[PDB]
């Protein structure tokens, strides 16, 4: 019983973290086998991050201008290249702690764990969701760049995020592990802002299911709704439209609880219209949207 914002155990990722320095700039890198991945903006000068040309900045660098360190210990760079917004540094020895892994690009609304690091050392781990607008509501200080987000399936780490920047609102932006940004962001210090964000409807519904598996069921009602009628209301409240695919995904949770998906939608409709009236669900006074249906099934079983 109980329900917590739970992250994946971070050990498999901890053993991959290193420090990458270029001149006076240090940030985090991810060391897998014989390669280190880090944000390319590690090569940028101060008054230079305004309008950088990375092709131009990189050609001026040699393997030996990169200082890579695993804890105390320098790792010799024997190669380097740029892949989109990432640098890939070949080093002259392999990381025996490299887990089984893959690189994945996640969809907005999905969740992942972030190992926040500074100077190549772990600070903490937390779970978050990729917002519909491609930002993350993270906790990053200066020097946190190059920290990664990931999920773990059995013994396999799926890396999905590397941190690059903070936006004016104080939300965070970054790339997949091929260096392609999530969202319309670029790695330069200009005026860019997060787009309109919505509440992740699919996740709220999953979380209502979690509550029911947990015996919090005051919010249920005798009504059902059509998909269309639900969307008419939810969209007034800045919720992402619900699709039949999303309905289908909630099948298993619906079967477990004997609550029809559209019946739960009806419950959510009333919660939105009337509010919670001082009540709480799974300890919360707001509707939580950073748990996917898979997250719910994994934690509640």
């Amino acid at each position: 019983s109980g329900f917590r914002k739970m992250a994946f155990p971070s050990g498999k990722v901890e053993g991959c973290m290193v420090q990458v320095t270029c001149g006076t700039t240090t940030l985090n890198g991810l060391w897998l086998d014989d390669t280190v991945y880090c944000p390319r903006h590690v090569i940028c000068t101060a008054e230079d991050m305004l309008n950088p040309n990375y092709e131009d900045l990189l050609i001026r660098k040699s393997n030996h201008s990169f200082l890579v360190q695993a804890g105390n210990v320098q790792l010799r760079v024997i190669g380097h290249s740029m892949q989109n917004c990432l640098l890939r540094l070949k080093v002259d020895t392999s990381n025996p702690k490299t887990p089984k892994y893959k690189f994945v690009r996640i969809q907005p609304g999905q969740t992942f764990s972030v190992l926040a690091c500074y100077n190549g050392s772990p600070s903490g781990v937390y779970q978050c969701a990729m917002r519909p607008n491609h930002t993350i509501k993270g906790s990053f200080l200066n020097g946190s760049c190059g920290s990664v987000g990931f999920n773990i399936d059995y013994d396999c780490v799926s890396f999905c995020y590397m941190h690059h920047m903070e936006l004016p609102t104080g939300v965070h932006a970054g790339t997949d592990l091929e260096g392609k940004f999530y969202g319309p962001f670029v790695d330069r210090q200009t005026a860019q802002a997060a787009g309109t964000d919505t509440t992740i409807t699919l996740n709220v519904l999953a979380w209502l299911y979690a509550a029911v598996i947990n015996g919090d069921r005051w919010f249920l009602n005798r009504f059902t709704t059509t998909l269309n009628d639900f969307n008419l209301v939810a969209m007034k409240y800045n919720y992402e439209p619900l699709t039949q695919d999303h309905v289908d995904i909630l099948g298993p949770l619906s079967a477990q609880t004997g609550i029809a998906v559209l019946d739960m939608c009806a419950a959510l409709k009333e919660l939105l219209q009337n509010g919670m009236n001082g009540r709480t669900i799974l300890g919360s006074t707001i509707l939580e949207d950073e748990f996917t249906p898979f997250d719910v099934v994994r934690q509640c079983s």
């Binding site: 903006h41 020097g143 760049c145 920047m165 903070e166």
Partner: peptide, 4 residues
């Protein structure tokens, strides 16, 4: 935007 700030490159963090």
């Amino acid at each position: 935007a700030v490159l963090x």
